Amino acid sequence: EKDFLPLYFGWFLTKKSSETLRKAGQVFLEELGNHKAFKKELRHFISGEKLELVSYFGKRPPGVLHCATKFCDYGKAAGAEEYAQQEVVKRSYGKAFKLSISALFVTPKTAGAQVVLTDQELQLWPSDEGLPPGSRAHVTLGCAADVQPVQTGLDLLDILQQVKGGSQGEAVGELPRGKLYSLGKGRWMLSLTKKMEVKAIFTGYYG
Ligand SMILES: [Cl-]
Ligand SMILES: [Cl-]
Numbered sequence: 001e002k003d004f005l006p007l008y009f010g011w012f013l014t015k016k017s018s019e020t021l022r023k024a025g026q027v028f029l030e031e032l033g034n035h036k037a038f039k040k041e042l043r044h045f046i047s048g049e050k051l052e053l054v055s056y057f058g059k060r061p062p063g064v065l066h067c068a069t070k071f072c073d074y075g076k077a078a079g080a081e082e083y084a085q086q087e088v089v090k091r092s093y094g095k096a097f098k099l100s101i102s103a104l105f106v107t108p109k110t111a112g113a114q115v116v117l118t119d120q121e122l123q124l125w126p127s128d129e130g131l132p133p134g135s136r137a138h139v140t141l142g143c144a145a146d147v148q149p150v151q152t153g154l155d156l157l158d159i160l161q162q163v164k165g166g167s168q169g170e171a172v173g174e175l176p177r178g179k180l181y182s183l184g185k186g187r188w189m190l191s192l193t194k195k196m197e198v199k200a201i202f203t204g205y206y207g
Helices: 015-034 036-044 080-084 087-092 150-165
Strands: 008-013 066-071 096-106 110-116 138-143 173-175 178-184 187-205
Touching: 008 015, 008 096, 015 096, 015 110, 015 138, 015 187, 036 178, 066 080, 066 187, 080 087, 096 138, 096 150, 110 150, 138 150, 150 178, 150 187
Parallel strands: none
Antiparallel strands: 008 066, 008 187, 066 138, 096 110, 096 187, 110 138, 173 178, 178 187
8 A cells, every 4th residue: 555645745834924925915916906007907807997806816725825846636646756755855844944935926817926946945846948947936825716726826937938028018016015017918016125035834735
């Protein structure tokens, strides 16, 4: 009888760190919704007055927030066994880490936070494109009704791809904690003046 792996590995934020990022995320969806530049380009955000984004991203993580590394599906996913067998993964299991979050973003599908992993933390990132490894690292804050949390990372990569070309353009707003950027196609990004640090434990979720 074999030992099945978790649903996925990842950094799970503490109560206080989750509380902080959660409320910060809420404050962002409230300011963005009330903002002038957003109300203008609302046609490219919804096919259908004001839109309250906190309600729009109705599906939100219930307990503590997290930053996933490798989706394993208890060993069914490709490379799950290989990832879990790594010394660095087994060594890091249950240990605390400090994740740096550089920006919060919003798309028609998801709302999340961009994670900038350290070189130490990148060793825990699966190497199973076009952007540097770990660019997909994120914390999902919310999803639209028929969107799956896996979308959040994909949305982030799409936004970072627009940053490669430099389609970010000039900041279309100054929020209390950073500069607002309009990427188009209902995509928005808040570059934080100060990268907020969150405390999290690297472990495995079984669900
Ligand atoms: Cl903040
Ligand atoms: Cl969808």
